[PDB]
């Protein structure tokens, strides 16, 4: 059993002083039904602006659907 | 002490029936029964004494003492009854003020952090039942306060019901009372008295001076008011004094 | 002169090609160093995966520790209370003892309450006949037997006066007794409820203890827990301590890194951006090294060709 | 004038052809951009699903507590309804004692009749020195004395029975009032619990409206269900970061910003029509 791998891993712990309650615990209130959880994860980049990209998605095709360059065919 | 047993816990409505069930028995039946008895043991001796019989003052004094003891008995017996009622009333107030227990709060009280009422002690020191609030006077003793001197001699106004000796101190003011009326010489059977008039007529005929009008003046004289026959009531002095007269007017 | 029009313009064009290929020579050096940086993942990803990432191994370790320390609270609180019922059983025994006290007490004070009522009433029997006897004697008018008859009432009244004595104590004692009993009775009711309240708490703690035992058991033998010697045994045919090559550098990047919480997301993405534009002209190295050298050499070659050409031009 | 104006035309035409080339790259730019919008929509939908699950849990628990209050209200109703009947019994039963007092006193009086008659009849046993007339007229009444006497006991025992009955009825009936007060206190605490709890319904509903409206702002609240993606916000965030970095690399590789380029592209393309109209004017 090579020494280095387990040297890298650690198992030492301190379960002596740590307690789940610092002094005591606050009991659940009879109306402790706070909805909460209105929002958990996200907010990387604004998304309404991404709606603009969604709009460009078909704006590109709408603009493609038109006469485009090399229209110098006028005579007389 | 040094045990899970706590001193006390506030009232629980589960056995509140028992709290209300607390109720003392009543003795008014026995009291009235013995009152009737003592009131008996006094009629017969009015005429059953011998002509040579001389001295019953000690008898009447003993009877009066016994009655006074009985009057105290009933008075403070009542007092205990009202105080017992007040005990359970105060306990109800305490229960209303008691922070009723539930869940695991019973241990917190067992720590001795908060108290609870204990009617046992509240009764050990119940509202002082000191003897007070009584003004005792009854016809049953109106008869005893006068029958000794009447028995000595019925024809004598010893009691004026004002000051123990008499109403008047240094004068003959007043009047000797003759029972049988000269208008109706026949003996009385059971006439009635108005307290203010301090006079009676005969078992029947108290409607003497009525012709259309239904009331008139005091019987003989020295009066400032007309009679009210709805105020007439039984008086013991009449037969109390007539008994000896009937017994002795012989031989 | 036409030969010159040809040689000089071709020499300018190939020099333009030389500078164009230089524009990608640096790009190819960048591509080589970029591929080496890309392969850096070969060491990094494999190492924190071979030594499974700390956010997994040490995460399991710490959550196991917190679950283990949770393991004892419920049972510790339970040890005292589960046996405290026996003290509670003894308290209930004491309360039913006070119930027996209630029974015997109330019974005997009821007995003296009957004693008092009987003593007054039944003795009232002879109190009654006094008048019957006296009137009976009196009816014999027709010599002096009246005295002893007239003496009775005194002693009779004294007897009844003395009789009322008890009544009072009897009356008071009973209630006093009853109330004491009631209070105790009251105490009794409270306790029975208390056991129940506690028993419900005991059931809650027992359920919680079993629940945390379930989490303790499941926390181990998990797929990653079962993965012991699999994230490590990807060296099925090279477990010969030869991994020490990365030992010191990875140790510096690890324990003394001052940061080991899903820090992979720092480079696992940046590698994607850099690698997404590469592999273009990868094998164009030879032209930029030998063909370019030949072209730049023919620069002097045809330069001297033009020297001789303009020399013949001067010879004109 | 003619050829001088034919140059400004062609150069600007090449400039526009350059803008179309840029738009060609912006096409793939947008094609890969759409991924972040899809991922965000998935995240918002799963969050909304969990929120509505929570609101249904709140509805279930409030329904349960309301049912408990319903049982409590039934307990109050049945009890109180009974107590009107007990109070009626206790207030009407007083007639029994009011009519029994006269019964007992008349029994005592009829016994007093025998009390008086006994001595009178017995007074015929005197010292005098078909003669049954000495005692026979009174002997039957003399034994009837006890038949009359038992009247007092059979009256007073019943009167004591009524006294204890009235006392017990009154006490145990009036103390049902404490039961009523205790149950009413329970009703009040439960009602105020309902009043403190229900507000959660509006607290969560205002949110539900906010997130559903936000999702609807993206013209899609049902179709993204077809999108394949892990049902975990944390992992969705990782895919979002991956695609975002890929988009940033694509944007900075071209060296130009898509929407800003498109803005100038619109006007530049319009320059084509502008130039042409005036060259037709040249005509």
From Swiss-Prot, chain A:
Q: Which organism is it from?
A: Saccharomyces cerevisiae (strain ATCC 204508 / S288c) (Baker's yeast)
Top-level division of the source organism's lineage: Eukaryota
- Oligomeric state and partners? Component of the Smc5-Smc6 complex which consists of KRE29, MMS21, NSE1, NSE3, NSE4, NSE5, SMC5 and SMC6. Interacts with NSE5.
Q: What is the lineage of its organism?
A: Eukaryota, Fungi, Dikarya, Ascomycota, Saccharomycotina
From the entire protein, which fragment is shown? 86 to 161 of 464
Put simply, this protein is called: DNA repair protein KRE29
Q: Where in the cell is it found?
A: Nucleus; Cytoplasm
Positions carrying Phosphoserine: 16
Report the function annotation for this chain.
Answer: Acts in a DNA repair pathway for removal of UV-induced DNA damage that is distinct from classical nucleotide excision repair and in repair of ionizing radiation damage. Functions in homologous recombination repair of DNA double strand breaks and in recovery of stalled replication forks.
Curated annotation (Swiss-Prot), chain B:
* Record's keyword terms, sorted: Cytoplasm, DNA damage, DNA recombination, DNA repair, Metal-binding, Nucleus, Transferase, Ubl conjugation pathway, Zinc, Zinc-finger
Quote a single Gene Ontology cellular component term: nucleus
Query: Where is this protein chiefly located?
Result: nucleus
Q: Which residues bind Zn(2+)?
A: 197, 199, 218, 223
Q: What is this protein called?
A: E3 SUMO-protein ligase MMS21
Q: Which Pfam families match?
A: MMS21_N (PF22326), zf-Nse (PF11789)
EC class of the enzyme, as a word: transferase
InterPro entries in UniProt: MMS21_N, Nse2(Mms21), Znf_MIZ, Znf_RING/FYVE/PHD
Where, subcellularly, is it found? Nucleus; Cytoplasm
- SUPFAM superfamilies per the record? RING/U-box (SSF57850)
A single Gene Ontology biological process assigned to it is:
chromatin looping
- Which pathway is this protein engaged in? Protein modification; protein sumoylation
What family is this? Answer: Belongs to the NSE2 family.
Gene name for this UniProt entry: MMS21
Quaternary structure, per UniProt, is: Component of the Smc5-Smc6 complex which consists of KRE29, NSE1, NSE2/MMS21, NSE3, NSE4, NSE5, SMC5 and SMC6.
A GO molecular function held by the record: SUMO transferase activity
Look up the further comments and give them: Present with 2800 molecules/cell in log phase SD medium.
Q: What is its EC number?
A: 2.3.2.-
Task of the protein: Acts as an E3 ligase mediating SUMO/Smt3 attachment to SMC5 and YKU70. Acts in a DNA repair pathway for removal of UV-induced DNA damage that is distinct from classical nucleotide excision repair and in repair of ionizing radiation damage. Functions in homologous recombination repair of DNA double strand breaks and in recovery of stalled replication forks.
Q: Zn finger regions (SP-RING-type) covering which residues?
A: 166-251
Q: Which PANTHER family match?
A: E3 SUMO-PROTEIN LIGASE NSE2
Q: Which residues cross the membrane?
A: none
UniProtKB/Swiss-Prot annotation, chain C:
What does the UniProt keyword field contain?
A: ATP-binding, Chromosome, Coiled coil, DNA damage, DNA recombination, DNA repair, Nucleotide-binding, Nucleus, Ubl conjugation
According to the UniProt entry, the coiled-coil residues are 1-136, 279-316
One GO CC term on file: Smc5-Smc6 complex
An example GO BP is: resolution of DNA recombination intermediates
Q: What about PTM?
A: Sumoylated by MMS21.
Q: Does the keyword Lyase apply?
A: no
Compartments reported by the entry: Nucleus; Chromosome
Predominant place of localization? nucleus
Task: Note the SS bond partners.
Answer: none
One example of the protein's molecular function in GO is: single-stranded DNA binding
What does the similarity note say?
Belongs to the SMC family. SMC5 subfamily.
Q: What else is known?
A: Present with 892 molecules/cell in log phase SD medium.
Q: What does this protein do?
A: Acts in a DNA repair pathway for removal of UV-induced DNA damage that is distinct from classical nucleotide excision repair and in repair of ionizing radiation damage. Functions in homologous recombination repair of DNA double strand breaks and in recovery of stalled replication forks.
Q: What does the record say about domains?
A: The flexible hinge domain, which separates the large intramolecular coiled coil regions, allows the heterotypic interaction with the corresponding domain of smc6, forming a V-shaped heterodimer.
The subunit structure is: Component of the Smc5-Smc6 complex which consists of KRE29, MMS21, NSE1, NSE3, NSE4, NSE5, SMC5 and SMC6.
- Tell me what this protein is called: Structural maintenance of chromosomes protein 5
**Natural source organism:** Saccharomyces cerevisiae (strain ATCC 204508 / S288c) (Baker's yeast)
Gene that this polypeptide is encoded by: SMC5
Q: Which residues of the full protein are shown?
A: 219 to 921 of 1093
Curated annotation (Swiss-Prot), chain D:
Quote the function comment for this protein: Acts in a DNA repair pathway for removal of UV-induced DNA damage that is distinct from classical nucleotide excision repair and in repair of ionizing radiation damage. Functions in homologous recombination repair of DNA double strand breaks and in recovery of stalled replication forks. Probably plays a role in structure.
Additional observations: Present with 339 molecules/cell in log phase SD medium.
The intrachain disulfides are none
Q: Where in the cell is it found?
A: Nucleus; Chromosome
Keyword terms of this UniProt record: ATP-binding, Chromosome, Coiled coil, DNA damage, DNA recombination, DNA repair, Nucleotide-binding, Nucleus
- The signal peptide, as residue positions, is none
Q: Name one GO cellular component term.
A: site of double-strand break
Q: Which family does it belong to?
A: Belongs to the SMC family. SMC6 subfamily.
Subunit description: Component of the Smc5-Smc6 complex which consists of KRE29, MMS21, NSE1, NSE3, NSE4, NSE5, SMC5 and SMC6.
The record's Gene Ontology biological-process terms are: chromatin looping; chromosome separation; DNA double-strand break attachment to nuclear envelope; DNA repair; double-strand break repair via homologous recombination; regulation of telomere maintenance; resolution of DNA recombination intermediates
Q: What is known of its domains?
A: The flexible hinge domain, which separates the large intramolecular coiled coil regions, allows the heterotypic interaction with the corresponding domain of SMC5, forming a V-shaped heterodimer.
State the Gene Ontology terms under molecular function: ATP binding; ATP hydrolysis activity; damaged DNA binding; single-stranded DNA binding
UniProt superkingdom: Eukaryota
């Amino acid at each position: 059993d090579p020494i280095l791998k387990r040297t890298i891993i650690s198992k030492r712990k301190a379960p002596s002083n740590n307690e789940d309650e610092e002094i005591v615990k606050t009991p659940r209130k009879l109306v402790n039904y706070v909805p909460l959880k209105i929002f958990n994860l996200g907010d990387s980049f604004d998304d309404t602006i991404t709606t603009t990209v969604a709009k460009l998605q078909d704006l590109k095709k709408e603009i493609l659907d038109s006469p485009r360059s090399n229209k110098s065919i006028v005579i007389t | 002490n040094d045990n899970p047993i706590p001193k006390s816990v506030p009232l629980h409505p589960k056995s509140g029936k028992y709290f209300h069930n607390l109720h003392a028995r009543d003795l008014s039946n026995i009291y009235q029964q013995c009152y009737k008895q003592i009131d008996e043991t006094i009629n017969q001796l009015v005429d059953s004494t011998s002509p040579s019989t001389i001295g019953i003052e000690e008898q009447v004094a003993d009877i009066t003492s016994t009655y006074k003891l009985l009057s105290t008995y009933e008075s403070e017996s009542n007092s205990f009854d009202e105080h017992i009622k007040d005990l359970k009333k105060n306990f109800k107030q305490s229960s209303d003020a008691c922070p009723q227990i539930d869940l695991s709060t019973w241990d917190k009280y067992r720590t001795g952090e908060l108290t609870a009422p204990k009617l046992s002690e509240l009764y050990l020191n119940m509202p002082t039942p000191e003897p007070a609030t009584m003004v005792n006077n009854t016809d049953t003793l109106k008869i005893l306060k006068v029958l000794p001197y009447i028995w000595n001699d019925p024809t004598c106004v010893i009691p004026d019901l004002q000051n123990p000796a008499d109403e008047d101190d240094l004068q003959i003011e007043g009047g000797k009372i003759e029972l049988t009326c000269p208008i109706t010489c026949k003996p009385y059977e059971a006439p009635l008295i108005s307290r203010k008039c301090n006079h009676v007529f005969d078992r029947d005929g108290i409607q003497n001076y009525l012709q259309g009008y239904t009331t008139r003046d005091c019987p003989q004289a020295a009066c400032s008011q007309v009679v009210s026959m709805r105020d007439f009531v039984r008086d013991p002095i009449m037969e109390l004094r007539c008994k000896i007269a009937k017994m002795k007017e012989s031989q | 002169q036409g030969n010159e029009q040809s040689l000089q313009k071709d020499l300018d064009f190939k020099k333009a090609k030389i500078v164009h290929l230089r524009q990608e020579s640096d790009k190819l050096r960048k591509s080589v160093e970029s591929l080496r940086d890309f392969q850096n993942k070969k060491g990094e990803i494999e190492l924190h995966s071979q030594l499974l990432p700390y956010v997994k191994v040490k995460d399991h370790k710490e959550k196991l520790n917190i679950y283990k320390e949770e393991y004892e609270r419920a049972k510790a609180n339970l040890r005292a209370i589960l046996k405290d019922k026996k003290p509670f059983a003894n308290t209930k025994k004491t309360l039913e003892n006070q119930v027996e006290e209630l029974t015997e007490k109330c019974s005997l004070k009821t007995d003296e309450f009957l004693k008092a009522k009987e003593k007054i009433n039944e003795i009232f029997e002879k109190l009654n006949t006094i008048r019957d006897e006296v009137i009976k004697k009196k009816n014999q008018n027709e010599d002096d037997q009246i005295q002893q008859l007239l003496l009775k009432q005194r002693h009779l009244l004294s007897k009844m006066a003395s009789s009322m004595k008890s009544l009072k104590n009897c009356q008071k004692e009973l209630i006093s007794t009853q109330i004491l009993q009631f209070e105790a009775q009251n105490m009794d009711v409270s306790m029975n409820d208390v056991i129940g309240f506690f028993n419900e708490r005991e059931a809650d703690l027992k359920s919680q203890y079993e629940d945390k035992k379930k989490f303790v058991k499941e926390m181990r033998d998990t797929p990653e827990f079962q993965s012991w010697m699999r994230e490590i045994r990807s060296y099925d045919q090279d477990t010969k301590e030869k991994l020490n090559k990365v030992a010191e550098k990875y140790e510096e990047e690890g324990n003394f890194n001052l940061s080991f919480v899903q820090d992979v997301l720092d480079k696992l993405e940046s590698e994607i951006a850099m690698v997404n534009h590469d592999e273009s002209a990868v094998t164009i190295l030879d032209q930029v090294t030998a063909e370019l050298r030949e072209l730049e050499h023919t620069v002097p070659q045809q330069s001297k060709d033009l020297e001789t050409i303009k020399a013949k031009l001067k010879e004109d | 004038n003619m050829a001088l104006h034919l140059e400004n035309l062609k150069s600007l035409k090449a400039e526009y052809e350059d803008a179309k080339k840029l738009l060609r790259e912006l096409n793939q730019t947008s094609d890969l951009n759409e991924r972040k919008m899809l991922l965000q929509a998935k995240s918002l939908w799963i969050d909304v699903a969990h929120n509505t699950d929570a609101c249904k849990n709140l509805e279930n628990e409030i329904s349960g507590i309301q049912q408990k209050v319903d049982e409590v209200t039934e307990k109050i109703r049945n009890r109180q309804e009974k107590i009107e009947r007990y109070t009626s019994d206790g207030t009407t039963i007083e007639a029994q004692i009011d009519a029994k007092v006269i019964y007992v006193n008349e029994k005592d009086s009829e016994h007093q009749n025998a009390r008086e008659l006994l001595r009178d009849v017995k007074s015929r046993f005197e010292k005098e020195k078909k003669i049954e007339q000495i005692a026979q007229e009174a002997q039957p009444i003399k034994e009837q004395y006890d038949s009359t006497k038992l009247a007092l006991v059979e009256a007073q025992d019943e009167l004591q029975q009524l006294k204890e009955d009235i006392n017990s009825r009154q006490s145990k009936i009036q103390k049902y009032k404490d039961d009523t007060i205790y149950y009413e206190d329970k009703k009040k605490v439960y009602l105020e619990n309902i009043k403190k709890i229900e507000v959660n319904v509006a607290a969560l509903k205002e949110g539900i409206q906010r997130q559903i409206q936000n999702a609807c702002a993206f013209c899609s609240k049902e179709r993204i269900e077809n999108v394949d993606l892990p049902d975990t916000q944390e992992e969705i965030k990782r895919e979002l970061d991956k695609v975002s970095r890929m988009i940033q690399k694509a944007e900075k590789s071209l060296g130009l910003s898509q929407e800003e380029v498109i803005a100038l592209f619109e006007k530049c393309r319009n320059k084509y029509k502008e130039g042409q109209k005036k060259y037709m004017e040249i005509d």
